[PDB]
Amino acid sequence: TVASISSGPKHTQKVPILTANETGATMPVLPSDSIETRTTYMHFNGSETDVECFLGRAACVHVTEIQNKDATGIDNHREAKLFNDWKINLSSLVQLRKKLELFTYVRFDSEYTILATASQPDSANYSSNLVVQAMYVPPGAPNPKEWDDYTWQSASNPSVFFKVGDTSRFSVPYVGLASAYNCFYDGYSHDDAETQYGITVLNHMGSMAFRIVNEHDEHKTLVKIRVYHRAKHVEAWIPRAPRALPYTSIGRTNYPKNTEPVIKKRKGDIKSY
Amino acid sequence: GLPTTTLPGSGQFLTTDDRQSPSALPNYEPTPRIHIPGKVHNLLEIIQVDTLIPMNNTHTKDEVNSYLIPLNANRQNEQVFGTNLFIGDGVFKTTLLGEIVQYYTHWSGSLRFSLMYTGPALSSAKLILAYTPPGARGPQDRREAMLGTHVVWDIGLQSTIVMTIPWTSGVQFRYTDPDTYTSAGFLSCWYQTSLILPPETTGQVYLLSFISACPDFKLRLMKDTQTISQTVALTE
Amino acid sequence: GLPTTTLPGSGQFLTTDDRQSPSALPNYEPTPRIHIPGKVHNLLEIIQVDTLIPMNNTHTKDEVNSYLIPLNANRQNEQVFGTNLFIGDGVFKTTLLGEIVQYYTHWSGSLRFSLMYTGPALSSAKLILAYTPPGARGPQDRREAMLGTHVVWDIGLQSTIVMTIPWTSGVQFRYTDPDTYTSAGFLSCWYQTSLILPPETTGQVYLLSFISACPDFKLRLMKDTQTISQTVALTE
Amino acid sequence: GPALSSAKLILAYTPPGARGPQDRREAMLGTHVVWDIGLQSTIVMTIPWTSGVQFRYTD
Amino acid sequence: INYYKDAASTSSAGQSLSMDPSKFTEPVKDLMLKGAPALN
Amino acid sequence: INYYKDAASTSSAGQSLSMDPSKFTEPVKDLMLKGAPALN
Amino acid sequence: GYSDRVQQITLGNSTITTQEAANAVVCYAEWPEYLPDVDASDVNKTSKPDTSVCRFYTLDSKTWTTGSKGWCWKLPDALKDMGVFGQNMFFHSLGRSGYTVHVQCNATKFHSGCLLVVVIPEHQLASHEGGNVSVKYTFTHPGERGIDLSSANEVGGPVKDVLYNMNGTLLGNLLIFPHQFINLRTNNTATIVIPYINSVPIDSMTRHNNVSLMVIPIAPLTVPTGATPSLPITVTIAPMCTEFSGIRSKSIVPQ
Numbered sequence A: 001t002v003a004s005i006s007s008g009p010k011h012t013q014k015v016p017i018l019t020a021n022e023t024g025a026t027m028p029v030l031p032s033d034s035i036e037t038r039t040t041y042m043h044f045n046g047s048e049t050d051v052e053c054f055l056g057r058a059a060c061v062h063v064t065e066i067q068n069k070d071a072t073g074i075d076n077h078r079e080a081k082l083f084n085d086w087k088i089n090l091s092s093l094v095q096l097r098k099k100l101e102l103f104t105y106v107r108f109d110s111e112y113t114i115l116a117t118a119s120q121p122d123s124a125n126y127s128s129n130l131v132v133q134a135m136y137v138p139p140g141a142p143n144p145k146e147w148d149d150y151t152w153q154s155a156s157n158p159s160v161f162f163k164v165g166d167t168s169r170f171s172v173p174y175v176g177l178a179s180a181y182n183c184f185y186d187g188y189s190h191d192d193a194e195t196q197y198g199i200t201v202l203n204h205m206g207s208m209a210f211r212i213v214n215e216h217d218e219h220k221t222l223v224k225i226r227v228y229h230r231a232k233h234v235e236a237w238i239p240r241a242p243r244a245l246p247y248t249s250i251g252r253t254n255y256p257k258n259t260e261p262v263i264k265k266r267k268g269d270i271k272s273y
Numbered sequence B, C: 001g002l003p004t005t006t007l008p009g010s011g012q013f014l015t016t017d018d019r020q021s022p023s024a025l026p027n028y029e030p031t032p033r034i035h036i037p038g039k040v041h042n043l044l045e046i047i048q049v050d051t052l053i054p055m056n057n058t059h060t061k062d063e064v065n066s067y068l069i070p071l072n073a074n075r076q077n078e079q080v081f082g083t084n085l086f087i088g089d090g091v092f093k094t095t096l097l098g099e100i101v102q103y104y105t106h107w108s109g110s111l112r113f114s115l116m117y118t119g120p121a122l123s124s125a126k127l128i129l130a131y132t133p134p135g136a137r138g139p140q141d142r143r144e145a146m147l148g149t150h151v152v153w154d155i156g157l158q159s160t161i162v163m164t165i166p167w168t169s170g171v172q173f174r175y176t177d178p179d180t181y182t183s184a185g186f187l188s189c190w191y192q193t194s195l196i197l198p199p200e201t202t203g204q205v206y207l208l209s210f211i212s213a214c215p216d217f218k219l220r221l222m223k224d225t226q227t228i229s230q231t232v233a234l235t236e
Numbered sequence D: 001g002p003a004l005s006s007a008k009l010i011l012a013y014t015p016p017g018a019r020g021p022q023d024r025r026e027a028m029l030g031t032h033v034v035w036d037i038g039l040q041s042t043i044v045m046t047i048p049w050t051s052g053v054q055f056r057y058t059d
Numbered sequence E, F: 001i002n003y004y005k006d007a008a009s010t011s012s013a014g015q016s017l018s019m020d021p022s023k024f025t026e027p028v029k030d031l032m033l034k035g036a037p038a039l040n
Numbered sequence G: 001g002y003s004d005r006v007q008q009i010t011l012g013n014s015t016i017t018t019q020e021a022a023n024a025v026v027c028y029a030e031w032p033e034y035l036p037d038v039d040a041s042d043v044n045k046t047s048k049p050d051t052s053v054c055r056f057y058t059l060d061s062k063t064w065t066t067g068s069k070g071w072c073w074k075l076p077d078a079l080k081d082m083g084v085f086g087q088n089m090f091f092h093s094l095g096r097s098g099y100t101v102h103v104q105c106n107a108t109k110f111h112s113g114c115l116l117v118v119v120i121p122e123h124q125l126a127s128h129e130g131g132n133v134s135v136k137y138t139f140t141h142p143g144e145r146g147i148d149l150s151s152a153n154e155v156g157g158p159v160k161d162v163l164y165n166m167n168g169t170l171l172g173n174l175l176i177f178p179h180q181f182i183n184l185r186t187n188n189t190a191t192i193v194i195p196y197i198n199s200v201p202i203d204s205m206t207r208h209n210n211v212s213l214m215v216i217p218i219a220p221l222t223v224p225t226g227a228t229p230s231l232p233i234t235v236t237i238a239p240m241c242t243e244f245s246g247i248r249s250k251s252i253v254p255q
């Protein structure tokens, strides 16, 4: 492939460099339309800018935490982190959001990877070996109420058992009601005068419930869960302007008030170098 | 039972791998795809669309006005604007090109810089745009500027002029984050003759300026952008 | 010894896998299969059999009577019953259809709603059944109702009428657990003319109503049902 | 008008049955042409035959 | 070799090697030729 | 590839792709045609 | 003698002529078309009023003055009240449509000024409150009036800051969306053909707008000496290939 062809002096009536940008086109002008060039080859394919590659590496999408401790006398397991949810996202941790929101519509298979590490902040004789259980108690699915409810039987509901310190991997097809996931949605769930706005209406896919299967030892053990997400089989439609201001909320476009100028001011003139 | 040996790296999680993993919910069944206009396949497809450069960066809070390069009637010999070409920083940085370049470590290729004139139709002007390849200082006067890559632009019916910064380089890749060894030059613009307004007309006229990449362009070695960060996880 | 590397996920137990495992008791020998009528292969086979809907839900303890929709002689213009179409909740919820839908997260397809009349043979009646697609309120009078999907039913020798709620939807799947965006409409029924009883006869007559799914139907993404739970393991 | 002036007009035909339009919104819902005044000096609007009965009276 | 039955479980896809910027760079109704005047 | 000798040790079965609701939806002795009267 | 410059669009019973065009944009290089069966889901036969809905509606005019910040209309909202298009809209459960948008602004060879005319698929607005405040319905359904970016923040309304496109992105990059400029010195109209763009084959016309049309002054209007300091901008829009499905009772929407 040639990156530049050889081209010499020109004295024509045919001027490729004068255009009318009002038309909305970006005319494909090249170095050889306005200087004299020599042949050179590309030596490159643009492999690593493919959208499959761009969205295809694991990104941290969520960090939560649960603890193993005596539940005796706990009136609210959920509240004691005796177990804990995660309202499936992908727009909470902004690093992968900007990436994703570079596109309007987007379709991609999935591959989740869960790392769990334990901490024992206060005096323990040892480090126990805990098994985590991760489950999908979606829309219709009985939500766990205690850390050892009938829910955890999860006999129809997928659920993972791995050891703290290890990692739990698995993948998932596109479980989005429509043909693509909306990165943006300028609508409502119905014509209500007060209903919510954004995509918070669509992004319906229940939550993930984590818990330790082990009963309690004498000390307490903090287990912190990190969920990583990798898109596989990606398809993206309609590019948009990149995100400039900071994010404030999952699912709304809102930016913070009295934000700071995002364009760097010159130290000098327009004329400055 | 077949005998195996495990190598160094067993059990590691590399976020940049591409191996198989079981399907949590088998026999599922995705929803069919329907047709949607606009599919993107490569980021190289989109960085060829031009977008406006806030060249007039001199303000103090972001304003529509930093997209406008002003022009003065009757000045002769003088300089319209100047900038270095660190596409990952400075004026370029918020443009779509600048914004994508920042997802990669290295770039190579030609850039297309165009200026669209917005003055009254009955006015006229001749400007010179000059590209100064690495190695010399930003030009200080047109004489200096005109000895490097340049285009005399004659403002006419055809409203825009497309200047190309041809890839001039020893090393075949430059860093997107500004680096010296790897630096690309300067871009300046001067009156060639001068802007002239018709009667009954007055004041400043402005040029809009765009930037996009030539088909020439290469970007490689993906990394994280300095353009976005956060202090606590967001919630709904 | 062949060199290997283990990946992330090694040692995990995913209750949704399909791999091989050794046979605890080899060379065993199962008992032969004999023929048994009734084999089921797909849950889609059974949700097409219709079952009764406790439409008359207004009681206070479960009774045979909530399966009976009453009809009054001589009323004109008025409304016989109304319900939304959240097949995973409310009247639908205990029906076989409702009961299976609850094992899945998403459903799509047409529903078949039929009414069998049980009044004396020498009586007569004309009813209108109306399906109101998502977007409007439950109809408030027949005029409103008759502008959407409807069937004038003439009570005759042929005892049942089968109304179909054709799949009317933007999005190709709806949630089985009631959700707004994903909501399916309303179903109402009104006197078209009115029920008329023969002489020597009196009181209320009832309609029985059934629900089953058309061959159209799709259910996907299995999950756990809210319809059953427990607090301690059972024993013998 | 002078050559250096410019204008955009809308001509509207309202078929029998409605009143003479009272504002452009009303007018623009019937047969209309946006005319852009340019080099080409004249605009030709056609009142297409809109009618139940195939002849009308001249009086 | 796929070891698994479902398609979601396969590795990353392979390069589009599609690439056609014209839907984005030249969505004009009447075709523009480089070198010919923009506005005739 | 089965690694094991016994049939119980193989993975899940593969979709019936049988599907015939008529034993449940139309177990009538004399065949009913849709469109023809139910009771003649 | 054909110029890129003169054009005629006839759609239904209405025609537009421009003698100073700058080509026309067809979003994503695709022209509006009806919904194919292979893509269909709802089993209902659809209604295609054709020429009674696919004609040109001219919205009320705006006034560009030196202080203008820009205006924003949403589709199909802007047309919610135009003739039979609008009736069909409130009466069917689902509908689908593409449009031809023609923005008009003429001046003289002594004026200067340049407007950006852009179509943004799925333009989800931001609340000026920040945090996760929502933007109420009424605020994103201005009707033919559209939203005036130089109007004041209101409560439950969107933010109207132009350098941020009403969503946290920079004005400068709107050029990645199908768009066309109106530069008084060149141009006097902008025309964009919009194909139907959605993640579902057909949708509700009232709970979801699928494009915002935005007209933004970028190079300020500058009139000749002692000229009146303003110009009107007019927007005319025509539904094209419209289809409605799931007819019934007639939606009632807030406010």
Ligand SMILES: COc1ccc(OCCCCCCn2ccnc2)c(Cl)c1
Binding pocket: A088, A089, A090, A110, A112, A134, A135, A136, A158, A159, A160, A172, A175, A181, A203, A205, A208, B024, B025
């Ligand atoms: C632990 O076992 C599981 C079994 C099934 C599961 O499926 C998860 C599907 C969620 C996909 C989310 C993709 N997304 C969400 C919003 N935007 C993109 C999950 Cl997450 C876990």
